[PDB]
Amino acid sequence: MFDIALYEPEIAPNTGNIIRLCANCGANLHLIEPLGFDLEEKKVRRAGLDYHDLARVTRHKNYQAFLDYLEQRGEYRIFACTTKTTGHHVDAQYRQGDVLLFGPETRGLPMEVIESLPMSQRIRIPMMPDARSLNLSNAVAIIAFEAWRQLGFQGAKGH
Amino acid sequence: MFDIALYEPEIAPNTGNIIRLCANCGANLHLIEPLGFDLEEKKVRRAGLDYHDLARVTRHKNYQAFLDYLEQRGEYRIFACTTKTTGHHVDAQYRQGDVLLFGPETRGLPMEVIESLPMSQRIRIPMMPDARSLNLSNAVAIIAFEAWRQLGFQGAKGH
Ligand SMILES: Nc1ncnc2c1ncn2[C@@H]1O[C@H](CSCC[C@H](N)C(=O)O)[C@@H](O)[C@H]1O
């Protein structure tokens, strides 16, 4: 129903956490190369997963490959998840086909990518005043579960 | 505000993640001993933390020490994150003074602790069927940011 996309993810445990999370809320996961890690079976199993958990995972050679993929697939909206905007994750009206795009742990999303999208499709999780940024998988968790809430948790156990 | 409490946390990176998270949303963090790890200065620095992040952290000898601390301080409600209930994190009405209680990664909260609280104060995060459990930090993030949302993000940058 909606997808999650990591731009050049750097830290493996984060991507592990985000794979569990996508299974939990039923999102597909997009990893835009280059990655700071391999999905080697031995590291994947050490973190309590296996090859079947990596079915929702699609790799792309670069950002433009990722855009070409979405166009040739169906209707979509990209949301740029960044500290560098004024609009909250709760003020966006989410819908089937949306893509939540997240920046790398260190540099964050490139200015060009964020600027390619209108204000309405840029979203910041509120933070205490003396705070620089959330851990990547925490940001994905928060924004993913706000989108899912707005979609009435379509497809959840007992719901 | 509201607080977060970890019952016998076992895995260090999770608790590191959760200390950053408490600073980011301005919650106090309660660690109920025994822990599965030491908080040695060299591991704390390796995980990108300092004195200021560790001021938010209060340790308790056991569950009852944690309860004694809370009643010596004012009104409070404990909310337990558990799979053993029907109520979603969204369906609870959170309020200033509430405490979000989380079980150890490898064990979950003791039956007795969950049973000590009424149905309304037991909460589960929605899950798609037959999905691996969330990383503990992500579960804390989801429930913490729902409580914060209901409190209109009191105290966030520019509020
Ligand atoms: N408050 C917030 N709102 C929205 N997304 C956030 C966020 N905090 C982190 N993220 C997401 O998590 C990614 C990794 S954090 C990167 C920021 C970097 N440490 C810096 O100095 O700026 C971000 O690019 C963004 O997509």
TrEMBL record, chains A, B:
<keyword id="KW-0819">tRNA processing</keyword>
<feature type="domain" description="tRNA/rRNA methyltransferase SpoU type">
    <location>
        <begin position="3"/>
        <end position="144"/>
    </location>
</feature>
<feature type="binding site">
    <location>
        <position position="125"/>
    </location>
    <ligand>
        <name>S-adenosyl-L-methionine</name>
    </ligand>
</feature>
<protein>
    <recommendedName>
        <fullName>tRNA (cytidine(34)-2'-O)-methyltransferase</fullName>
        <ecNumber>2.1.1.207</ecNumber>
    </recommendedName>
</protein>
<keyword id="KW-0489">Methyltransferase</keyword>
<dbReference type="InterPro" id="IPR016914">
    <property type="entry name" value="TrmL"/>
</dbReference>
<dbReference type="GO" id="GO:0008757">
    <property type="term" value="F:S-adenosylmethionine-dependent methyltransferase activity"/>
</dbReference>
<dbReference type="GO" id="GO:0008175">
    <property type="term" value="F:tRNA methyltransferase activity"/>
</dbReference>
<dbReference type="GO" id="GO:0002132">
    <property type="term" value="P:wobble position uridine ribose methylation"/>
</dbReference>
<keyword id="KW-0808">Transferase</keyword>
<dbReference type="GO" id="GO:0002131">
    <property type="term" value="P:wobble position cytosine ribose methylation"/>
</dbReference>
<dbReference type="GO" id="GO:0042802">
    <property type="term" value="F:identical protein binding"/>
</dbReference>
<dbReference type="Pfam" id="PF00588">
    <property type="entry name" value="SpoU_methylase"/>
</dbReference>
<dbReference type="InterPro" id="IPR001537">
    <property type="entry name" value="SpoU_MeTrfase"/>
</dbReference>
<keyword id="KW-0963">Cytoplasm</keyword>
<keyword id="KW-0949">S-adenosyl-L-methionine</keyword>
<feature type="binding site">
    <location>
        <position position="103"/>
    </location>
    <ligand>
        <name>S-adenosyl-L-methionine</name>
    </ligand>
</feature>
<dbReference type="InterPro" id="IPR029026">
    <property type="entry name" value="tRNA_m1G_MTases_N"/>
</dbReference>
<dbReference type="GO" id="GO:0005737">
    <property type="term" value="C:cytoplasm"/>
</dbReference>
<dbReference type="InterPro" id="IPR029028">
    <property type="entry name" value="Alpha/beta_knot_MTases"/>
</dbReference>
<comment type="function">
    <text>Methylates the ribose at the nucleotide 34 wobble position in the two leucyl isoacceptors tRNA(Leu)(CmAA) and tRNA(Leu)(cmnm5UmAA). Catalyzes the methyl transfer from S-adenosyl-L-methionine to the 2'-OH of the wobble nucleotide.</text>
</comment>
<comment type="subunit">
    <text>Homodimer.</text>
</comment>
<comment type="similarity">
    <text>Belongs to the class IV-like SAM-binding methyltransferase superfamily. RNA methyltransferase TrmH family. TrmL subfamily.</text>
</comment>
<feature type="binding site">
    <location>
        <position position="133"/>
    </location>
    <ligand>
        <name>S-adenosyl-L-methionine</name>
    </ligand>
</feature>
<dbReference type="GO" id="GO:0003723">
    <property type="term" value="F:RNA binding"/>
</dbReference>
